[PDB]
Structure formats: C-alpha cells, structure tokens
Amino acid sequence: AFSHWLAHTAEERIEEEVSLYGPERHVEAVFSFLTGISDACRLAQHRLSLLLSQMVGSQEMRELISLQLVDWNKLQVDHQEERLRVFCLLSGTP
C-alpha cells in the first residue's frame, strides 16, 4: 500500500517533471523511471536490463552485485555515473 502510495505522492512532481526530463535529456532520467519499471525498460530499449528486474526483489542479490560494481564501479567511473547509481539501488542501502 505504501509503495504505490509513495509513488502517487511523488507524482505530479515526477509527473510533468520527469515528462520534460525524458522529452529532454539525458541520463538520470533512467534513475528517475526506476523511482517511478517495464515502461522505463521499454523506453531505455542488455546486462543492466536483466539486473533492473531484480528491483522490487528483496533478494540477497544486493551485497554481491554491490561490492562487485563498487570497486570496478569507481574503476570505470573513477576514470559511467548512470550505472553505479543503479547498482547502489540494488545494493538496497542507497
């Protein structure tokens, strides 16, 4: 009840806002659609896509993928910023 409730609360604000966001540019939005999943994946449309479906899953996937990225995370980012944030979400401790 709360989940969907939270969504409705952060609506209109994510509503027309995220609307422009999409009809605009660029990244981040991918994260914002995740705050809003299947439509976001369809708009984005491969490896990230399969990990995204684990969201809404409270499964012990968190830690693994987390630490995995993380190191290699900064390794790539240190020297994409729209991929580490998705991993922070699936870690479950954002």
Partner: protein, 65 residues
C-alpha cells in the same frame, strides 16, 4: 516430463564436457588480460556509454575486452 527434450540436454551436457577452453593463466586470453580495473586506458586517456556515442574507447581497452 519430456524425456525427448531431456535427452537433448544430456547431449548438451556431453558437448559441454568435451569443449575446448583457452587457458586463463598460460595464454594471452587472461594472463595478459589481468588489467587492474576495467577501461583504465580510456579513463586515463581521453582519446552503455559507447553504445550511446561513437568513438570513445581506447584501442587498448577494446583489445583487452
């Protein structure tokens, strides 16, 4: 339930059993691909991010990939 499909799996398990793997640590495939971090050359040198846009990746990072 499907013995016919499960027989196909036993053939797959057999084909996988007799597969050739390249070496890790005795061929250039992984011993020489022991880069400390992913895309170190493209991070150190300017020249979904490459599917998003054209040219970025350094030739060395593509070779390593």
């Amino acid at each position: 339930r499907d013995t016919l499909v499960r027989q196909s799996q036993l053939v797959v398990d057999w084909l996988e059993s007799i597969a050739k793997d390249e070496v890790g640590d005795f061929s250039d495939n992984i011993e020489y691909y022991a880069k400390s971090v992913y895309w170190e050359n493209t991070l150190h040198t300017l020249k979904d991010a490459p599917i998003r846009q054209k040219l970025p990746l350094d030739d060395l990072d593509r070779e390593d990939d």
